[PDB]
Ligand SMILES: CC(=O)N[C@@H]1[C@@H](O)[C@H](O[C@@H]2O[C@H](CO)[C@@H](O)[C@H](O)[C@@H]2O)[C@@H](CO)O[C@H]1O
C-alpha cells in the first residue's frame with residue numbers, strides 16, 4: 048500500500064486560521080480532500096501560538112490542533128502533525144523568547160531544548176487521544192534556521208544536531224504513531240550543513256524528503272525535461288543511500304508544481320510524471336502533495352507562485368492538477384513495490400557515512416548530472432555510498448551489477464537554496 | 472481632576488491571555504481594579520496577533536480588544552489602548568512579515584507604514600464604538616526598536632521619525648478620545664536618538680513619560696534617597712520643558728517600584744513619595760502605575776523583578792503597594808494643581824528646540840545633578856530652554872525670577888538603558 052495525501056493549507060485564513068478558525072470551513076476543506084481519495088493530511092500549527100512563553104503552553108492552541116485532527120478523522124483521513132513552525136512559505140514564526148533581547152539557539156540552548164521536549168510531549172500526549180493521529184514531525188524544514196543563507200541563523204555543529212535529534216525524537220515516540228523530522232534539500236546539497244544525510248536516513252522512523260524543482264532543476268535542465276520530472280525520484284534514491292538499513296522507508300512528504308519555474312498548463316503532466324517516476328523507488332512509502340488549497344490572494348509578501356500551489360483554488364474548486372493527483376491515488380495506492388535496481392551511482396563518504404562532497408549532489412553537480420544521464424538512458428540507476436560499493440558481499444546481495452563513480456567531481460551549477468530571487 | 476489608573480496585566484496568562492481569553496477572569500481583574508479606586512486602565516494587545524500578515528487583520532483579535540474595553544467601561548473604567556506591541560517587559564512581539572527573510576523597517580518602509588496606518592484606522596473605528604475608549608497610544612515605548620542598544624534595530628533619522636509620527640497620529644485621531652504615543656527615557660538621555668524631546672512635547676495630544684528608577688537613578692543617588700523619589704517629578708518637568716505649549720498636559724503613563732533596585736518592604740513608601748513629589752508638577756494629568764497584577768511565577772525568562780511589579784499578587788489579593796496607591800488616589804484625585812515655580816534650570820537647545828547635550832540630562836548628568844541639588848535644597852526648580860531664558864518678557868510672564876545654567880556640562884554617569892544587566 049502506497050500512501051497519498053496533502054499538506055493542508057486552510058482555505059480561509061491560511062495558517063493565520065489558528066488565530067480565528069472557521070471550523071465549518073475547515074470541515075469543508077477536509078471533506079473535499081477526502082472526497083478526492085486522499086488518505087492523509089499533514090497539519091501545521093504555529094509554534095509561538097502553542098508556546099508563547101518558554102514555560103507556558105497555550106492549552107487552547109493544543110486543543111485546536113486536536114480538533115483539526117479529529118475533523119480529519121471524521122472524513123477518513125489520517126493526520127500527521129508538524130510541531131516547530133518555525134518556517135512556512137518563506138515566513139519565520141518564532142517565539143519572542145528566542146528573538147531580539149532574548150536571542151537564543153533552539154538547537155544548543157539547554158533550556159530551549161527542554162521546552163521543546165515539553166511541547167512535543169504535551170502534543171503527543173494530547174493528540175494520541177485521537178485515532179486519526181498517525182505521526183508527529185518535529186517541524187517543517189527545521190534545518191533552515193541552522194545555517195546560511197538564513198539571515199539570523201542558529202548555528203550548530205552536526206554533533207550538536209545529533210544531540211538535538213536524540214533529545215526530541217524519543218519524546219515524540221509512542222504506539223500508534225510515527226516520530227519524524229523534515230529538512231529542506233540543503234541537507235544533501237550544502238557542504239558543512241549541520242543537518243546531515245546520515246541523520247535523515249537513520250533518526251526518526253522514516254527518511255523524509257521535500258522535492259522542489261525551483262532549486263535549479265527546472266531552471267538548468269528545463270522545466271519540461273525528463274530530468275526535471277525525475278527529480279523527486281533522484282531525491283528518494285539519494286536520501287535512502289545514506290542509511291544503515293537499505294529497507295528504511297522514504298516519505299516524499301512535500302512535492303509541488305511551482306509556477307515560478309513551471310508553466311501553469313503543464314502542472315498536471317508534471318504532477319503525473321513526477322509521481323510515477325518517484326514510485327520507481329521501492330522504498331517509497333507515500334507522497335504528500337504541496338498543497339491542498341491556494342493561499343488567499345488577499346495576503347501579501349508571499350513569493351507569487353505560492354498562491355497557486357493548491358489542488359483546489361480559493362473558492363474550493365478542484366483544479367486540473369487536483370484531478371490528476373486524485374487519479375494517481377486511485378490508480379496506484381494499491382500498486383506493488385518497484386523492482387530492485389542493478390545499476391548504481393557511487394558517492395564517496397567519510398567514516399561517518401556522509402558525502403565528503405555535498406555540492407556535487409545538487410542540481411547541475413557532477414553526481415546529479417551522472418544520475419540523470421543514466422536515468423534518461425533507461426539504466427534505472429540507484430545510489431550507494433563508497434562504503435557499500437567496497438563490500439562485494441553487499442553488492443551481490445543487493446543484486447547490483449554495474450557501478451558508476453563520479454570520476455571528476457564538480458559543484459552544483461544550477462543550485463539555489465532559496466525559493467525567490469528576492470531572498471538572494 | 473487628577474487621574475489614577477494602572478497598566479492592566481491580566482492575572483491569568485499575562486498578555487498571552489489574548490490567545491485564549493478567560494473573560495470571567497478578565498471581568499474580575501477589572502472589577503478589583505475599579506474597586507481599588509482607579510479611574511482608568513491601559514490595555515496591551517499583541518501586534519502579530521492583530522496583523523499576522525501585512526494585508527490581513529485578525530478581526531477576531533480586534534473584537535477581543537473591543538470586548539476588553541467594553542468590560543472596563545462596565546466597571547466604570549476609562550480604557551486607553553496601545554497598538555504596536557512590539558515591546559513588553561523585555562520581550563519583542565514582531566509580525567513575521569517584518570523579520571528574518573522579510574526583515575524590514577517599521578519606521579521607514581512605505582508599505583509597513585501603510586499597513587500600520589490600516590491597523591490604527593481599523594482599531595480606532597472599532598474602539599470608537601465603545602464609550603469607555605478614551606485614547607489610542609501608537610505603542611508601548613516604540614522608540615526602543617529605532618536605535619542602539621536594540622540587537623536588531625530598525626534605524627531611522629529624526630526626520631524619518633517625524634514623518635512616521637505625522638503619518639500615523641492623524642489616523643488615530645477622532646472625537647471622543649486622545650491620540651498619543653510613548654517612548655522610553657532614551658528620548659531625553661541618549662544623544663543622536665531619533666525620537667526627540669521636541670517630538671514628545673509637540674506630537675500627539677499629551678506629553679507621555681515612563682518613569683523607571685532602574686535606569687541608574689536608584690543605583691547612583693541611592694534607592695531610598697530623596698533624589699530617587701523625586702525622579703518622576705524631574706522627568707515630568709524635563710519633558711514639558713521642550714514643548715512650545717507651556718500648558719500641554721504631562722501623563723505619567725508608567726511608574727513602578729522595581730525590586731531589582733529597591734528592597735521589597737520599601738516599595739509602598741517609594742510609591743507614596745514618588746507620587747506626592749510628581750504631583751508638584753502643574754501640568755501632570757494623571758499617574759498610571761505599572762502594573763495591576765504580578766506576572767505569574769510559572770512564566771520564565773522575565774527579569775526576576777517583573778514578577779512582583781503588581782498592585783495585586785498572583786492570588787489576586789491586594790498588596791501593600793496597592794493599598795498605598797488606592798489611598799493616594801482617594802486623597803489626591805480632587806486636589807488642585809500645584810503652585811507655579813520661580814526657579815528654573817536652563818537647558819541649551821538647538822534651533823529645532825532640542826537639547827544640544829542629551830547625555831547631560833540623564834541620571835548623574837550635569838543637568839540632572841543640578842536640578843536634584845536645587846530640588847533637595849527646597850527650591851522647587853522647574854526647567855526651561857535657553858530660548859525661553861533669552862526673553863526677559865517671557866520670563867516675567869511665567870513668573871521666573873532666578874535662573875540656573877549648566878556651566879560645566881558632563882555626561883550621565885549613572886545611566887543604563889536596559890532594565891537588566893543580562894541584556
Ligand atoms: C525563504 C525560503 O526560500 N524558503 C523556502 C521554503 O519556503 C521552501 O519550503 C517548502 O516550499 C513551499 C513552496 O515554496 C513552502 O510554501 C513551504 O514552506 C514548504 O515547506 C523550501 C523548499 O524546499 O525552500 C526554502 O528555501
Ligand SMILES: CC(=O)N[C@@H]1[C@@H](O)[C@H](O[C@@H]2O[C@H](CO)[C@@H](O)[C@H](O)[C@@H]2O)[C@@H](CO)O[C@H]1O
Nearest residue numbers: 148559560561655656683888889890891894
Ligand atoms: C530590553 C529592556 O531592558 N527593555 C526595557 C523595557 O522593558 C522597559 O519598559 C517598561 O518597563 C517595565 C518594567 O521593566 C516593563 O514591564 C514594560 O515593558 C514597561 O513598558 C523600559 C523602561 O524604561 O526599559 C527598557 O530598557
